[PDB]
């Protein structure tokens, strides 16, 4: 028919190769070294997580006997809820200011798509031509809503404030910083304001606010570096969470100059401007104060998991020896 | 034009139209959940390169035509049913989660002000609209890049058959061929094989050794190079001086014309320009038998359109040949009518005893002494032919020649008259005996028959030939041994009848095709139609349980018929190694067609799937190429459905935690490239290089073939195991980050706890989990297999950063939206400490069950592979 097939390892199916065989001497140790590294890391995660001092406060006021049940029906729009809490152990290092929303599905298919991301990117065409993605919130009456979308519309708009009640009983306000809550990339890369101009007013012409927002997106923050679509709270909000019960970094508390703890143990009061209704759909709202750990944050699931799988790796490892010895 | 190529590429295949039906489904913005990119881009690749792999053939044909001037796979049938099984399961869940979402839009959807917007929408109507979303979002449950990958796996695996140096003949220069690059996995699933026994189990190198004349045996040492005349060119060391001197002088008439018949009744292309008087015979028997005559002086000089210059002892006597009764495989004989210069007309005939004994004279002295001779010849693998003549009065030739002239005119059709005219005069003939010529088994055939038999491939030999040459050759190639009990066909009629009124190491049997159809029997009609069909299927059950059965005296028409029966009425996978024009029929019938080059025409070669030169090469075709091809093929499937079911089903679980709304748990582009870029290479290379054992060890242990035939390594259940193990895996990829995402996962100034980082972590733990899964699957870790796996994972991470880089965002902000998610999710020790956890939780139980299953139930390869020798 044809000439000789040229003799090569590839064509003759005799390439050089290693034949990894799963003997006892190769599977048993990988199990233990996993079981002897998942336990100590699991212990490391767990102890550090339990070493993180944290306090969680639920201020939705839906249950009776809470002293802001009045805010469930704000006959007058601004309703203020006050909660007193005491810190048993001082926080060391900077402390993170949070908020949470339980049973709030920010990840709904219809909900997530509702965003003209190109318009969140400051695309001049996208402002006056919101995508069909944010169809129901394209326009208010005649002109299109710039922060279009259900998500941008439905922005968590409370104001959680922390006051330290000293021995004199006079509230001492606690410093909270509104910068550096979002990622570096999101501030400068994903989320951008429109092009040109100097003032955000003239830049957002021919566009109304979302129906839910009380005020336009022009002056969301006094600082010009944190107003508009680069608003820190917006970026944290709009950057949809992965679960119904989620948590979001609200503000920062950096370390005080003095050697004293950032949040000394004592009695503190939480004065929140209730503005977000979550009782309609069995939702909640929370505030969480947490101190930094050099190895991430309080994640008992990972710590408990590594103990759990790390042990099972050892239990799997010690199980395998008997079968090997019996069938030697 | 190239547009017609894709038109039929879509309609015939179950899934190629599926994803076309889906593309319009994602086209309308009403139900646009997953963009058309998700299906269009992987649809072009699967349809694009698949056309390229076949466009080369068409381009080749166009060139060859200008300057000069259907088999389907068992695996193919399953995959079509699997896509249907994905269709029902996908739509079952698309409605199975429509009930769950139906409530959610009423209880939680109505009150949830952040979702309601002011358009009247019933809780069940919202369930209807999403029912398209569930279909769309989980569209990639059906593997888009399957049909492309199957073709590439077979095309590569077919070229190893062609390229094998150990299936390449030396003197003929005839490498193996894979004509049909479409059924490679079947070579590993072969249950039955079929052969011709001439050119298949023999060399076709025929050298005259013995013959029978007047019932006497000639060719035995008694009473020796041929140096007495110029015609008898010395190339055949003969013996039996009696025969040598019997022709020198005192020639008997019967002995005289005997060698004359060999030199006249034939169709060779005689040569005289060389001066050596060569022969070039289209059929091996005529060429060798004619050469015997010249060695004995009866040399054939030349032939013209109607005259022949045959010579005898230098007495060049020219006969006028008027008609030729050609040989075709169906008639199994040849005859010739010639006019002697004296004035008479002489008729000579030759061929098999069966079709010539049906036309014996009323009584001949050479009848029984001939009959007891051929078996003696055939008892040691001699191809014996009966040679007989007749002289007819001129009056007999008168009426017999007009009907030729009627049949001689070509016109549009001339095929039936020639059949009837040949038979009627030939019914009576005068016999001499029968010749005999040896064709020895080609080397290595006993090995392959022995080796394949231990691989549990049932081997049958189909041949219109002696029921003795193959029966004696069978023991000469290990086809049959002492244990098997070959019995004649008389008992089969009684035994097969006996079981019928009841209903109203190896086994073998010896039967004849002339009698084979009697078993098949080739209100009463319906009863009788099922009467023979019950015998038909039952007999094939008496045959299917056999690794050696002698089905012989079967014509071309009866070759394909037998391959039909077991192929249809057993569903067993059939290969056929064949020879000559006579076997082109069955080689089409069998699932795999194989044809040996031989020396009887490139007919079976050109009407086959995989063709090579020697039967011994059948070893590496099945035990090395077919066996690896199946393991390479159906290990690809197990990983290929797995990698997709474990891929989409994150959509299922993430649906429970987003209002059952069918949200994408992955980046938009992670669905496109997953089937074509992130898991396509390592499974393909495994599909071309995965040797569970070495080629030398593959032939040393034929027992590894049991996997393909029994189809153990892949079943219908193993499809769901790849689903359930994909359900379990999809949970782990989803819930392990979920538990790590419910709490803080390193929340700081750079606090990744969002959905995008949730998607990246799931994607990262996916490719590593599956690309380590294929790494945990490859038994033959070549430096390219290792490159494919780590290159695949490196490829996933390599372009993810590009996809997540700030540069691509400006390119397509609305389509490439994940930005800095990996760079903000893969720098956290917690996330990697979670990906390691998710990857570990994904693989350690897999490693544990692979080891545990390997320990409690070691595989055939495993037991063989534990040793270094
Ligand atoms: C803080 O966010 C909440 C969202 O939970 C805002 O409540 C929403 O306010 C808008 C109007 O600002 C309501 O839309 C419509 O208001 C008109 C009156 O202008 C009323 O007639 C309509 O029936 C409709 O309510 C919207 O309904 C309301 N949200 C809900 C769940 O009812 C709130 O205004 C925001 N406040 C601040 C200070 O940001
Ligand atoms: N060219 C031939 N001419 C006459 N008889 C033949 C010829 N070849 C084979 N035979 C005889 O008729 C039978 C048919 O041989 P067959 O197997 O059909 O040919 P092949 O296998 O070489 O293609 C044989 O048993 C033999 O006795
Ligand atoms: C909370 O503190 C305020 C001010 O100190 C006080 O008026 C109020 O009664 C306190 N409520 C409770 C429940 O302690
Ligand atoms: C709480 O905050 C509001 C808003 O600034 C303020 O008016 C009020 O005096 C504060 N203290 C309360 C409500 O006890
Ligand atoms: F070898 Al055959 F017909 F007997 F092709």
């Amino acid at each position: 028919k044809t000439r000789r097939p040229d003799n090569t390892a590839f064509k003759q199916q005799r390439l050089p190769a290693w034949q990894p065989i799963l003997t006892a001497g190769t599977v048993l140790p990988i199990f233990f070294i996993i079981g002897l590294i998942f336990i100590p890391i699991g212990i490391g995660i767990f102890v550090t997580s339990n070493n993180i001092r944290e306090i969680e406060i639920d201020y939705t006021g839906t249950e009776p006997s809470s002293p802001c049940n009045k805010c469930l029906s704000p006959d007058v729009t601004p309703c203020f809820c006050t909660i007193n809490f005491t810190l048993e152990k001082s926080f060391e290092g900077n402390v993170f200011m949070y908020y949470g929303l339980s049973n709030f599905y920010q990840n709904h298919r219809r909900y997530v798509k509702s965003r003209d991301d190109s318009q969140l990117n400051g695309d001049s065409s996208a402002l006056l031509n919101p995508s069909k993605e944010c169809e129901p919130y394209r326009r208010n009456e005649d002109k299109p809503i710039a922060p279009c979308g259900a998500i941008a519309n439905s922005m968590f708009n409370d104001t959680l404030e922390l006051f330290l009640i000293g021995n004199d009983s006079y509230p001492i306000p606690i410093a909270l910083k509104k910068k550096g809550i979002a990622w570096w990339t999101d501030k400068n890369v994903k989320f951008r304001n429109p092009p040109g101009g100097d003032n955000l007013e003239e830049r957002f012409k021919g566009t109304t606010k979302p129906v839910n927002w009380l005020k336009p997106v022009y002056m969301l923050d006094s600082d010009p570096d944190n107003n508009g679509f680069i608003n820190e709270d917006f970026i944290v909000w709009m950057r949809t969470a992965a679960l119904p019960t989620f948590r979001k970094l609200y503000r920062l508390i950096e370390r005080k100059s003095d050697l004293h703890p950032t949040l000394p143990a004592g009695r503190y009061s939480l004065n929140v401007t209730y503005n977000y209704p979550v009782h309609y759909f069995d939702g909640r709202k929370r505030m969480i104060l947490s101190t930094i750990s050099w190895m991430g944050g309080k994640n008992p699931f990972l710590g408990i998991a590594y103990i759990a799988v790390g042990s099972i790796s050892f239990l799997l490892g010690v199980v395998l020896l008997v079968i090997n010895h019996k069938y030697r | 034009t190239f547009i017609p190529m894709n038109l039929f590429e879509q309609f015939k295949r179950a899934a190629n139209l599926y994803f076309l039906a889906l593309l319009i489904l994602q086209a309308v913005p009403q139900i646009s959940t997953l963009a058309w990119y998700t299906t269009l881009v992987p649809l072009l690749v699967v349809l694009g390169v698949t056309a390229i792999k076949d466009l080369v053939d068409d381009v080749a044909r166009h060139k060859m035509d200008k300057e000069i001037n259907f088999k389907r796979t068992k695996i193919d049938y399953l995959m079509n049913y699997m896509v249907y099984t994905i269709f029902v399961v996908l739509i079952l869940l698309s409605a199975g989660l429509a009930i769950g979402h139906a409530y959610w839009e009423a209880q939680v959807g109505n009150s949830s002000w952040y979702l309601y917007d002011g358009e009247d929408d019933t809780p069940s109507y919202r369930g209807f609209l999403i029912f398209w979303g569930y279909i769309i979002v989980l569209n990639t449950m059906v593997p888009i890049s399957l049909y492309v990958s199957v073709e590439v796996i077979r095309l590569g695996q077919s070229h190893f058959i062609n390229w094998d140096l150990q299936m390449y003949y030396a003197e003929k220069d005839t490498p193996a061929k894979a004509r049909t690059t479409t059924l490679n996995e079947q070579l590993g699933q072969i249950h039955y094989i079929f052969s011709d026994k001439t050119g298949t189990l023999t060399q076709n190198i025929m050298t005259f050794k013995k013959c029978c004349i007047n019932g006497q045996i000639y060719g035995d040492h008694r009473d020796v190079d041929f140096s007495w005349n110029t015609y008898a060119d010395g190339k055949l060391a003969f013996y039996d001086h009696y025969l040598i001197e019997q022709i020198q002088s005192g020639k008997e008439p019967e002995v005289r014309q005997f060698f004359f018949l060999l030199a006249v009744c034939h169709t060779v292309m005689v040569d005289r320009t060389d001066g050596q008087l060569n022969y070039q015979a289209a059929s091996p028997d005529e060429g060798a038998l004619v050469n015997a005559a010249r060695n004995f002086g009866f040399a054939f000089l030349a032939r013209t359109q109607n005259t022949i210059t045959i010579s005898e002892l230098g007495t060049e006597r020219t006969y006028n040949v008027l008609a030729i009764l050609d040989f075709n495989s169906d008639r199994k004989r040849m005859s010739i009518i010639v006019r002697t210069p004296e004035g008479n007309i002489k008729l000579y005939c030759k061929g098999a005893d069966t079709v010539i004994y049906e036309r014996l004279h009323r009584m001949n002295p050479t009848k029984q002494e001939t009959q007891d001779a051929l078996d003696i010849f055939a008892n040691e693998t001699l191809r014996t032919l009966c040679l007989c003549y007749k002289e007819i009065e001129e009056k007999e030739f008168t009426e017999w020649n007009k009907k030729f002239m009627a049949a001689s005119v070509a016109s549009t059709n001339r095929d039936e008259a020639l059949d009837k005219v040949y038979e009627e005069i030939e019914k009576d003939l005068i016999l001499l005996g029968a010749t005999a010529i040896e064709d020895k088994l080609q080397d290595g055939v006993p090995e392959t028959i022995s080796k394949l038999a231990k691989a549990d491939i049932k081997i049958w030999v189909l041949t219109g030939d002696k029921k003795e040459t193959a029966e004696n050759i069978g023991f000469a190639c290990e086809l049959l041994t002492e244990d098997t009990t070959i019995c004649y066909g008389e008992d089969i009629n009684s035994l097969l009848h006996a079981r019928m009124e009841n209903q109203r190491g190896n086994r073998a049997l010896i039967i004849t095709g002339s009698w084979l159809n009697e078993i098949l029997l080739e209100q009463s009609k319906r009863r009788l139609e099922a009467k023979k069909e019950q015998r038909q299927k039952n007999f094939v059950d008496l045959a299917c349980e056999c690794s050696a059965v002698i089905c012989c005296r079967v014509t071309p028409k009866q070759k394909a018929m037998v391959v039909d029966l077991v192929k249809r009425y057993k569903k067993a996978i059939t290969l056929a190694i064949g020879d000559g024009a006579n076997d082109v029929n069955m080689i089409k019938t069998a699932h795999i067609g194989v044809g040996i080059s031989g020396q009887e025409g490139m007919q079976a070669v050109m009407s086959s799937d995989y063709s090579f030169a020697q039967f011994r090469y059948l070893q590496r075709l099945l035990l090395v190429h077919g066996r690896w091809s199946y393991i390479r093929m159906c290990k690809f499937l197990r990983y290929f459905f797995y990698k997709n079911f474990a891929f989409t089903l994150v959509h299922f679980w993430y649906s429970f935690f987003n209002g059952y709304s069918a949200q994408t748990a992955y980046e938009d582009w992670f669905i496109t490239l997953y089937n074509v870029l992130y898991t396509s290479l390592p499974v393909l290379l495994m599909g071309l290089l995965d040797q569970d054992v070495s080629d030398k060890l593959s032939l040393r242990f034929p027992g590894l073939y049991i996997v393909g035939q029994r189809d153990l390594l892949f079943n219908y259940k193993r499809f769901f195991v790849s689903l359930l193990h994909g359900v379990l895996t999809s949970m782990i990829l989803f819930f392990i980050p979920l538990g790590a995402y419910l709490q803080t996962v390193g929340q700081d100034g750079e606090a990744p706890s969002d959905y995008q980082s949730f998607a990246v972590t799931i994607a990262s733990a996916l490719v590593i989990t599956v690309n380590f899964q294929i790494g945990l699957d490859t038994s033959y870790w070549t430096f390219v297999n290792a490159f494919s796996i780590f290159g695949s994972i490196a490829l996933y991470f390599g372009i993810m950063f590009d996809f997540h880089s700030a540069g691509i965002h400006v390119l397509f902000p609305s389509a490439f939206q994940f930005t800095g998610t990996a760079s903000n999710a893969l720098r956290q020790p917690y996330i990697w400490l979670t990906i390691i956890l998710t990857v570990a939780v994904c693989l350690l139980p897999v490693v544990a069950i692979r080891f545990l299953s390997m320990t409690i139930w070691p595989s055939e390869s495993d037991k063989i592979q534990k040793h270094r020798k």
Side-chain angles (χ1 to χ4, degrees), chain B residues 472-720:
Chain B
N472 296 109
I473 285 277
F475 305 101
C477 56
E478 182 64 26
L479 213 56
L480 303 169
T481 60
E482 293 82 3
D483 196 291
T484 187
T485 178
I486 53 167
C487 197
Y488 289 107
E490 49 260 20
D491 65 348
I492 290 165
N493 260 326
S494 65
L495 293 179
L496 188 153
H497 275 96
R499 88 187 282 187
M500 185 64 72
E501 282 95 7
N502 205 321
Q503 294 168 107
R504 201 204 317 175
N506 184 8
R507 205 152 182 261
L509 57 87
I510 48 173
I511 50 171
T512 58
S514 75
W515 181 66
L516 177 69
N517 294 174
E518 274 68 356
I519 298 301
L520 275 66
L521 189 63
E522 290 271 319
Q523 196 273 325
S524 64
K525 172 259 178 188
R526 281 164 291 165
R527 197 184 71 78
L528 284 171
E529 181 261 316
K531 182 64 70 177
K532 63 95 174 179
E533 293 271 319
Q534 187 67 86
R535 301 186 69 160
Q536 176 173 174
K537 198 172 72 174
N538 281 126
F539 181 76
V540 170
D541 291 353
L542 320 166
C544 274
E545 64 95 25
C546 304
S547 189
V549 176
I550 301 299
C551 287
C552 84
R553 298 292 183 184
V554 297
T555 187
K557 190 170 79 87
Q558 298 299 288
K559 298 291 180 68
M561 183 278 288
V562 181
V563 174
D564 289 330
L565 294 175
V566 65
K567 167 159 105 163
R568 292 183 291 113
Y569 286 152
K570 180 53 64 67
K571 318 272 185 296
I573 301 300
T574 64
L575 180 140
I577 190 166
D579 187 41
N582 54 351
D583 278 301
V584 298
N585 204 358
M586 66 182 180
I587 299 164
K588 299 289 94 175
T589 300
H591 291 255
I592 309 301
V594 177
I596 280 165
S597 301
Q599 293 179 356
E600 50 178 357
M602 295 296 172
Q603 301 265 296
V605 179
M606 295 296 172
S607 72
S608 63
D609 298 307
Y610 315 86
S611 173
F612 51 66
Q614 285 222 330
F615 183 105
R616 95 198 174 209
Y617 297 170
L618 203 64
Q619 267 163 353
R620 302 188 60 88
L621 186 63
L622 314 180
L623 313 179
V624 178
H625 289 71
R627 205 187 63 72
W628 286 345
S629 285
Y630 174 88
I631 290 168
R632 287 160 182 195
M633 186 72 212
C634 64
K635 286 203 178 139
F636 155 90
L637 288 193
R638 265 162 45 172
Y639 175 85
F640 198 80
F641 293 136
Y642 180 75
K643 83 201 187 63
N644 290 126
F645 298 177
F647 173 92
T648 68
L649 288 171
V650 180
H651 290 307
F652 181 76
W653 295 112
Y654 189 34
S655 181
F656 287 73
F657 294 83
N658 55 25
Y660 291 81
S661 78
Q663 193 190 9
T664 74
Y666 303 108
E667 189 176 342
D668 206 2
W669 313 103
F670 188 64
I671 299 89
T672 58
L673 315 189
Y674 182 82
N675 283 283
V676 294
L677 193 64
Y678 289 172
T679 55
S680 291
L681 187 68
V683 73
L684 272 175
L685 277 296
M686 183 177 176
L688 297 172
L689 305 172
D690 178 280
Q691 321 178 352
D692 49 338
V693 293
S694 56
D695 61 349
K696 184 166 75 68
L697 197 56
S698 293
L699 293 162
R700 185 177 178 180
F701 286 111
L704 301 183
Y705 201 81
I706 301 299
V707 171
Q709 305 187 318
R710 304 191 178 167
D711 217 333
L712 308 185
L713 175 148
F714 197 108
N715 298 310
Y716 209 83
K717 69 191 86 80
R718 305 233 173 161
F719 169 74
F720 298 127

Side-chain angles (χ1 to χ4, degrees), chain B residues 196-200 332 383 462-465 559 579-580 582-583 600:
Chain B
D196 188 358
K197 187 268 182 182
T198 300
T200 48
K332 298 293 184 182
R383 267 286 287 279
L462 310 165
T463 181
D465 189 358
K559 298 291 180 68
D579 187 41
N582 54 351
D583 278 301
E600 50 178 357

Side-chain angles (χ1 to χ4, degrees), chain B residues 734-767:
Chain B
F734 171 74
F735 280 117
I736 283 284
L738 187 146
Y741 267 68
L742 285 169
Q743 294 112 340
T744 177
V745 74
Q747 292 164 356
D748 313 310
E750 294 293 328
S753 187
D754 63 346
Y755 152 71
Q756 283 191 359
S757 302
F758 191 63
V760 170
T761 294
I762 297 169
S764 298
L766 182 57
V767 290

Side-chain angles (χ1 to χ4, degrees), chain A residues 16-297:
Chain A
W18 292 352
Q19 280 260 36
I21 191 66
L22 304 178
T23 66
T26 180
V27 303
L28 183 63
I30 180 58
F31 268 64
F32 287 124
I33 68 179
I34 287 280
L36 277 296
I37 191 167
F38 277 22
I39 301 285
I41 194 73
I43 298 287
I45 301 299
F46 182 76
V47 298
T48 293
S49 76
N50 296 115
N51 208 350
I52 292 161
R53 298 176 178 88
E54 210 165 271
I55 192 66
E56 183 178 1
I57 294 166
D58 191 325
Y59 64 92
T60 184
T62 187
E63 294 294 328
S65 302
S66 168
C68 54
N69 284 122
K70 61 192 180 69
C71 294
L72 265 74
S73 64
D75 51 3
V76 66
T77 80
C79 189
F80 295 100
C81 173
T82 304
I83 301 299
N84 310 318
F85 65 94
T86 180
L87 268 184
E88 299 155 348
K89 306 290 182 66
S90 86
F91 293 145
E92 292 276 74
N94 64 7
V95 176
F96 295 95
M97 187 66 203
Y98 273 22
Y99 66 81
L101 297 165
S102 80
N103 294 338
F104 177 89
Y105 294 72
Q106 186 168 1
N107 50 351
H108 187 273
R109 203 195 70 52
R110 186 268 187 189
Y111 198 51
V112 61
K113 66 182 290 294
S114 297
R115 63 194 285 168
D116 192 5
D117 45 35
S118 176
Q119 190 274 331
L120 300 174
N121 302 132
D123 291 331
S124 295
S125 160
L127 282 71
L128 277 296
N129 179 17
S131 75
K132 300 289 94 175
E133 300 178 353
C134 51
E135 159 54 31
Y137 314 91
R138 281 176 56 82
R139 68 180 65 252
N140 185 12
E141 81 296 10
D142 283 294
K143 57 198 190 176
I145 309 164
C148 81
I151 311 161
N153 186 45
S154 64
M155 183 177 176
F156 183 85
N157 57 356
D158 291 331
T159 303
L160 295 150
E161 292 179 353
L162 280 168
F163 298 100
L164 169 45
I165 301 299
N167 57 354
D168 60 352
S169 180
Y170 276 52
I172 299 100
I174 286 151
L176 306 166
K177 294 181 176 67
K178 52 174 72 167
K179 292 296 193 151
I181 62 170
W183 300 359
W184 181 65
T185 63
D186 302 333
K187 294 294 295 301
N188 309 276
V189 191
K190 284 179 74 67
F191 297 84
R192 292 188 296 272
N193 297 332
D198 181 69
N199 188 359
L200 269 288
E201 190 80 29
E202 61 183 1
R203 278 248 297 271
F204 278 91
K205 299 289 94 176
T207 44
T208 50
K209 63 176 190 64
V211 302
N212 288 124
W213 290 23
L214 187 153
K215 52 179 296 310
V217 72
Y218 307 165
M219 72 291 291
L220 260 175
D221 191 67
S222 303
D223 195 326
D225 189 76
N226 206 6
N227 68 342
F229 293 166
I230 56 170
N231 167 255
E232 287 266 27
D233 296 310
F234 194 117
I235 285 154
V236 172
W237 177 250
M238 186 66 204
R239 179 177 209 80
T240 71
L243 272 300
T245 313
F246 56 91
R247 319 185 324 171
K248 294 185 169 271
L249 183 62
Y250 184 12
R251 293 181 184 271
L252 277 296
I253 297 169
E254 320 181 25
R255 180 53 172 284
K256 300 288 96 175
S257 182
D258 202 300
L259 182 135
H260 293 284
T262 54
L263 266 75
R267 55 183 197 280
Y268 291 73
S269 74
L270 172 63
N271 182 23
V272 65
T273 310
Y274 183 77
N275 291 339
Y276 200 73
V278 298
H279 65 285
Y280 297 137
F281 44 95
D282 186 74
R284 313 282 290 198
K285 317 198 280 148
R286 303 191 307 277
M287 194 267 314
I288 297 169
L289 272 160
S290 189
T291 186
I292 187 57
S293 60
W294 56 277
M295 171 189 51

